[PDB]
Symmetry: C3
Subunit: 547 residues, 3 copies
C-alpha cells in the first residue's frame, strides 16, 4: 500500500494499459484487453516499459529505438574496450549482424583487445581516431591485437576487409617473432586513409592485385617484415594504385614489398626513417615517384630506396620528385647516375639534381644541368621529331647585335654538300660565312684512290689531274670555292721541289659552268719553273660545292 | 488493486509529482501543485514520463534529449532505408528542419529509395559508406534513386547541395533512357571525396564555374552522359579545380564534359576504363595533368584522352605524368608527337616517352630523348636567357684528357668575325685550334662582285686585286691567316694555264699592320711563268680575321 | 487512491523491486530485500528508473548507457552552441573527462561561442562540417571564438591540439586588432583536412617544427597575419610537411610564414587571392612546388609568391607546376627568368613557360623552349655523364636521306687532333667529310713563334721552313691534307712579289711516311721565278692531322 509493486496473479484479468512487474521487477504494460497471459512466460499482449521501443523523442515523434540506428559500433555487441577483455567475439557479432552497415565502427573511447582473428565479412574498418605513436593515444582509442595469443600466430588479425580502412589506430602487443599481421584487404577498389599502425609482421596485406587502390596519410611504425605487402599469387599484375603521405619508421624489413609486378602506380611524399628496405618489386613499369625522404637504416648498412629485382623490369617511370638520401640510402634513379648498357632503372628523372632520361636496356642517357648537357653513350643526336622528314636542320646561334642593338642569331648550313656558319656585317649590311671545305688528296702510292663524297682525283696525262665524279655521283658543284694545296714532288716524302698550278672546270653539260656556274668537277694542271707539265707524287685540294 | 492503471478523473485534485495514465495508456506526471487540468486535452502542468526529455544519463547529468542532438540523420525524420519505401519526404523534412546541421546524414544501415527530387537547401551530403560497385554494398548503405519515377525524368535527384559530398554510395535504378542525374553542386568551394556513383545521366552536375573545387577518391561507374558535367552557362570560366584518384568505368559517354573553359585545374591518377570519351572542354589553359590510365572504349573505336575543341584553345599546360593508352585511346599530348603549324595541344610534356615543349599556334617543338634532341621546325636555336645580352656564346666540349687524366673540355669561338674550335696539346702544353675561314671568290663574269661579311675582291690594275672593305665595313683583320686559291685563266671555264701569287696587306692606318698586325684587307698579285702580271678570270681566297 | 505517488516513509520496509518517489518526484526502485534506507539521503539499495542505466535496447540486450558511449560531444558536457552562451567551460570539461576519446567533437548543429582559451589536453579537433565562408554555415555548425574577450587578447584560442584537425568551420568574431589566433598544434605527426577558418591573427600555429605534417583541403580567409605560422624557436628545421588544396583569401598578411628553415616539404594546388604575401621562409631546401594561382593583392603593390630571405638559402627545389600571376604577384622561379651570379632561387623549373635548371650560388642556367636552348652564362657544355670518361663525343645530325628514303644522320669528329663533319653520297655510296684544318702562320716579325697544338714554323735555311713539333709534342700527322698559303715577301706589309712552294714530309721514324703515311710535320720550300730559294717575311699553312 505504501509502495508500488504487483507481480502477476493468475486470478486477475488485466485491462489494456494495466501495469505490473515481472518476477525480475521490470514493469510490463498490457497492450490488449482481457489480458490473462503470464508475461513471465509469454510476452504476447505485453511490452516492457523500460525498453527504448517504448521511449519517445517528442522532437521527432519517433522511438529511441529508431534514433539508436543512427550509429552502431562494436560497443552495441558487448565490446568493452578496456585494455584487458578480449573483444573478438563482439567484433565478430557486429560483422555477423543484420543491423550493421558497410563498415565496422569503434566506440568513442576504448583500447579494444583482440585475441582471436576477426572475419570482417566484407565490412570496412573505421576507428575512433588516427593518433600519434604513443600510449596516450592507444589508451584513448585503438585496436590492440594480442600478438601473444597462440590462435593469432602466423595469421592476419582481420580478414576480408571491405574497401575502407580509415580514422584508425591499431597496434600489436607482445607479438615479437609471432608473425602476426594486421589486415587483409582486396586490391580492387580501396580507400585507405588516416591510419596509424604499430608493430605487426605485415601491416597491410593486399590480396590479389592492386587496381583503383588508394592509400594515403598513414603512419606505419615498427613493422617486422613490411608496412604494405602484395603477393599477387596469380600474377594478375597490380595497376593504378596510389600511395601518398606515408611515414614508414623503424621497421625491421621493407616499407613495401610487391612479390611481382606493378604498373601505373603513384608514390608521393613518402618517408623512410630507420627502415631496412624501401619499396621492393619484381617489375616497376610506368609508375610515378614524387618526393621521398630517406633517412637512416635500422640495421642494414646500404639499401636502395627503390629495389626492382627483374632484369630490365624497371622501365617507363617518372622519377619526378627529389629523393633525399641520408644515413646509407642509395638510389639507382638519380639524373646524374651514369647509364649502364642494360638494367638501368628506366624513366625520366627530374629534380634540382638534373633533368635526365634513360631506357632500361640501352646505354643512351641525356642529362641537362645548369652548365649544359651530358650524354651516357658518348653521342648526341640532333634530328626531326618526324621520322619521315629528310630535310637538313639549321642551327641558329647568337653571335652579336644588329644595328638597333637587338640580338643577332646567325644560321648555319649542314647538308650533304655544304658545311657553313653564317655571319652578318651590320656596318655594311652584308651577309657572310665561315666554311669547312671538302678536302681530298691525290697520292700515287695509295692502293686505291681517296674518295670524298663521290669525288676522287685521277691522273689524266702528264701534269693534268681530274677532280672527278665517280659512277653514281650525280651531285654538282655550284659556284664553288677552290683551293689547291701543296705538292710533294718526286716521291711520297717529297724532294722539296715545287710546282705551279692552274685549274679548269669540268662541266655537267655544255655551258653549265660558263653560263650557270655548275660543274661536275675540275682539272688541276701542274707545271715546273720552265712552265713544263710535271707530275706531283701527292697533293691536296680543298673545295666547296656551293658559294 | 492488483495492477496499476488510473485514468484522468475530473473530480480529483492531482498533487505535484502525481502520476496517471492518458487515455492511450502513456503515463503523465504532474509538474504543478493543485493540478485539475485534463492531460488528454491540455498538457500544461504535465509531462510524459516516457519522453527522452524525462530520461537522464547520470554520467553527464543531462537528458537523453540532449544526447540525441549529437548525431541526427534522415532516420530521425522517418526514413526507412528498406529498399522499397520512398524516403524523399523524410530527406526533405531533414533539410527543412531547424535542428539539422551543415550536412544531411544517412543512418547506419539502409538502402534509401528516392522517387522524388530532394532540395538539399544548401546542406552537404554525407553517406554511410563508400562501397564497391555491388549489391552487397548497396544493401548495407546507399542512396538508391528510382530512375523509373516519372517525377525524376530529365531532372537531377538532388539540387542545391552544399560544399560537401562524402562517404557516399549512390545509384540510380531502372533509369536507362530517362536522363536522371544525381546531384547539383555549386562550383565555388567544394570538397567531394570518397564517393561511389552508379548509373545516372550526369553523375556530378557542377553549377556555375569551378573555383576552389576539390574532387578526390571517386568510383564513377556506368554514367550515360558524363561522370562530371560543367555547363558554365554564363561563361564565368572555371579555375582552380582539382580532380584526383577518380575511376571512370563503363560510361556510355565521357568522363568529364566542360561545355566551356577551364584554367589552372589539376587532374591526377585518373582511370578511364571502357568509356566513350575522356575529358572534353572548349578551352584548357594552364592546367596540370598527371597520371592517366586509359584502357578500352565501350562502343567507340578511337578517342583522345583529352579533347579540346577550341582552335588554339589548349595552351599553357603541364602534361607531366605518363598516359597509358590501351584499346583505342589516343593522345594529342605525347612528347614524341610531331608538331603542327597551329592547333597543337600547347604545353610541356614530361614522361619516360620524352621531355618536350610546344606552343599551340606554332610549329616549334623541342624534344629531349636518351639519344639527344629532336626539333619540330627543322631549326634549333642557341642564345642567352636575357634578351638584351649580345655577346657571343662559347660552347665547351669534351675532347680528351689533361695530363692528370681529368676530362678536358675545349672551347669554341663563333663571333661575327671568327669561327674556331679550340684544342690543347698536353704533351707540349700548347693551345691549338681548328678553323673555318671566310672564303671569297673573284669572277669577272659575275654581274655583281661576291661579298663575304663586308669584303669583296676588285681588280685594281693588271694582275693586282684588292680584297677590300666595302663602305660601312669598319671591322678589321687582326693577325689573320691567308690562303689564296686556284686561278682559272683566260675564261670562266679556264684554259688550264697557271699563275703565281704574292700578297700585300692593306692597312687601316699608317703602320697598323707593320706594328700591330691590324689590316683592312690585302692585295693579291698574280704573275705568269715569265714573272709578268696577269689577270685570272676567276680565283678564290680564304682568310681569317683573327689568329 | 486515484493517482500514483508515494514518498519515503521511515516506518515501512520496502521489498526488492518496490517503487516509490524521491521528494523531487523521481521514481526509485529497491534493488535489495528488507530496504529501510531513505533514498533521498542514501541511494544504496536503490536505483533511479528514469536513468539510462535502467533503460534497455532489446535489439542488443544492452543499456542505453552503453549506446550513449558510441559518440560523445561537447553537448554531453553542457555546451549550448546557441551563438550567445560561452561554451568554453563545457569544451574544457570534455577535454578533462575520463570518458572522451582521441578527439573533441561538436554536436550536430551549433554555433559554439568561446570566450576563454581551451586546453585540448592532446585531443584533436573534429567539427560538425566544413562550410563555405558565410553566416549560413556558421549558424548551422562552427566554433565562433569571441575576439572581443579580454582573456583571449594576444593568445591562441585552442592550445595543445592533438594530431587531428578536421571537418571544421571556425571563425573569430570582433577580434580586429586583438591578435587572437585559432589553434596550436605540434609539428610532429599531424593530419589537418577539410577545414574552413575565418579571421584570426594566425589561423594555424605550428609548434616546434614540421615532420610528417599533412595539411589539405582548407579555406583560410581573412587572417590578419598568417594562415599558417611556424616559428620553430629552437631551430629544429621543418621537414616532410605537405600543403595541398589550400585557398588563402583576403588575408592582411601572408599565406604562410616560416621564421626559419623548411626542407623536403610539398606545396600543390594553392590559391593566393588578395593576400599581402605568399609563402615566406628563411630557407627553402629540396621542396616541391606544384600549381599556384596567385590573383591580386589586398593592399600591397608587388609581392613574390615565394619569398626566401636567407642568402643562397633557396636551393634544391622543384618548381614543377605552373604559377599563375595576376594583379601584382611576381616570381623568382620562372624558367625564363635570367640568372644572377648568386642568390638565385635554386632548383628545376618545369612548366609551359619552359624547362630550366639553376643553382643558387652561380650564374649557370639552362633553359629549353620550343625554339631550342638558352643559357644564363654565355656558355653551353657538352660532356659525358661519367666524370672519369675521357673519350671524345660524336654528334650526329640529320642532313638528308639514304637511298631508301630514311633519315641519314651524319657523324662529326672533334678530337684533340681533328675537327670534321661527316657526309655521305648515296648516289655513289661514298663517305665524305667537311674539314676545319689547323692554321698556322710564320712571321719573322713575331716576338715568339706562333704555335698551334704543339706545332710551330721555323726557318731552317734560306727558303726552307720546318712545320715542326715542339718539345713534348708526341702527336703525329696520319695521311693528312696540306695547303700552303700566300707569301708576304720582303717586309711584313709585303712588296707584292710572289713565290712558289713545294713540301717535304718530316718522318717520326725511318720510313714512317713513305710506308705508313705517318709524319711528325713537314718542310715548306719557297722559290722565286728563277727557281732560287727565297725567304718570305710571313706566310700561312693549313693542314690536318688525319685524312
Amino acid at each position: 500500500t505504501q509502495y508500488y509493486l504487483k507481480y502477476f496473479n493468475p486470478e486477475i484479468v488485466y485491462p489494456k494499459n494495466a501495469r505490473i512487474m515481472l518476477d525480475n521487477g521490470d514493469i510490463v504494460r498490457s497492450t490488449v484487453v482481457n489480458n490473462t497471459s503470464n508475461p513471465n512466460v509469454d510476452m504476447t499482449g505485453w511490452v516492457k516499459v523500460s525498453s527504448v521501443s517504448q521511449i519517445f523523442d517528442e522532437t521527432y515523434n519517433i522511438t529511441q529505438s529508431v534514433i539508436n540506428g543512427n550509429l552502431i559500433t562494436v560497443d552495441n555487441f558487448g565490446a568493452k574496450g578496456d585494455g584487458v577483455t578480449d573483444d573478438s567475439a563482439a567484433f565478430q557479432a557486429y560483422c555477423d549482424s543484420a543491423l550493421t552497415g558497410q563498415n565496422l565502427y569503434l566506440g568513442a573511447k576504448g583500447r579494444y583487445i583482440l585475441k582471436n582473428q576477426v572475419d570482417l565479412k566484407g565490412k570496412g574498418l573505421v576507428g575512433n581516431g588516427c593518433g600519434k605513436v604513443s600510449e596516450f593515444y592507444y589508451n584513448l582509442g585503438c585496436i590492440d591485437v594480442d600478438g601473444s595469443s597462440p590462435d593469432l600466430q602466423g595469421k592476419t588479425a582481420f580478414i576480408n576487409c571491405g574497401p575502407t580502412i580509415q580514422n584508425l589506430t591499431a597496434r600489436c602487443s607482445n607479438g615479437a617473432g609471432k608473425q602476426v599481421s594486421f589486415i587483409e584487404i582486396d586490391g580492387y577498389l580501396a580507400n585507405i586513409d588516416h591510419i596509424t599502425l604499430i608493430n605487426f609482421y605485415n601491416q597491410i596485406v593486399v590480396k590479389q592485385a592492386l587496381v583503383g587502390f588508394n592509400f594515403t596519410n598513414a603512419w606505419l611504425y615498427y613493422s617486422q617484415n613490411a608496412g604494405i605487402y602484395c603477393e599477387d599469387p596469380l600474377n594478375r599484375v597490380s595497376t593504378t594504385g596510389t600511395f601518398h603521405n606515408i611515414y614508414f619508421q623503424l621497421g625491421d624489413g621493407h616499407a613495401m614489398i610487391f612479390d611481382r609486378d606493378v604498373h601505373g602506380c603513384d608514390f608521393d611524399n613518402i618517408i623512410f626513417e630507420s627502415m631496412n628496405g624501401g619499396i621492393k618489386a619484381r617489375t616497376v613499369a610506368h609508375c610515378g615517384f614524387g618526393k621521398f625522404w630517406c633517412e637512416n637504416l635500422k640495421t642494414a648498412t646500404s639499401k636502395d630506396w627503390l629495389e626492382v629485382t627483374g632484369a630490365n623490369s624497371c622501365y617507363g617511370n617518372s622519377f619526378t620528385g627529389y629523393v633525399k638520401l641520408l644515413g646509407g640510402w642509395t638510389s639507382k634513379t638519380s639524373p646524374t647516375l651514369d647509364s649502364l648498357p642494360t638494367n638501368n632503372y628506366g624513366g625520366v628523372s627530374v629534380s634540382a639534381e638534373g633533368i635526365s632520361i634513360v631506357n632500361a636496356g640501352n646505354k643512351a642517357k641525356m642529362l641537362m644541368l645548369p652548365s649544359g648537357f651530358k650524354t651516357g653513350n658518348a653521342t648526341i643526336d640532333e634530328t626531326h621529331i618526324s621520322s619521315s622528314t629528310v630535310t637538313p636542320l639549321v642551327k641558329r646561334r647568337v653571335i652579336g647585335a644588329d644595328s638597333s642593338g637587338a640580338q643577332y642569331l646567325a644560321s648555319d648550313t649542314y647538308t650533304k654538300l655544304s658545311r657553313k656558319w653564317g655571319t652578318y656585317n651590320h656596318g655594311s649590311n652584308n651577309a657572310g660565312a665561315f666554311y669547312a671545305p671538302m678536302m681530298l688528296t691525290y697520292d700515287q702510292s695509295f692502293s686505291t684512290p681517296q674518295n670524298n663524297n663521290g669525288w676522287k682525283i685521277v691522273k689524266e696525262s702528264t701534269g693534268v689531274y681530274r677532280v672527278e665524279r665517280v659512277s653514281g655521283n650525280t651531285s654538282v658543284i655550284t659556284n664553288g670555292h677552290i683551293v689547291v694545296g701543296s705538292p710533294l714532288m718526286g716521291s711520297r716524302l717529297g724532294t722539296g721541289t715545287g710546282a705551279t698550278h692552274g685549274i679548269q672546270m669540268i662541266e655537267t653539260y655544255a655551258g653549265s659552268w660558263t653560263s650557270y656556274t655548275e660543274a661536275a668537277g675540275f682539272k688541276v694542271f701542274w707545271r715546273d719553273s720552265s712552265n713544263a707539265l710535271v707530275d706531283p707524287h701527292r697533293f691536296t685540294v680543298a673545295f666547296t660545292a656551293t658559294s
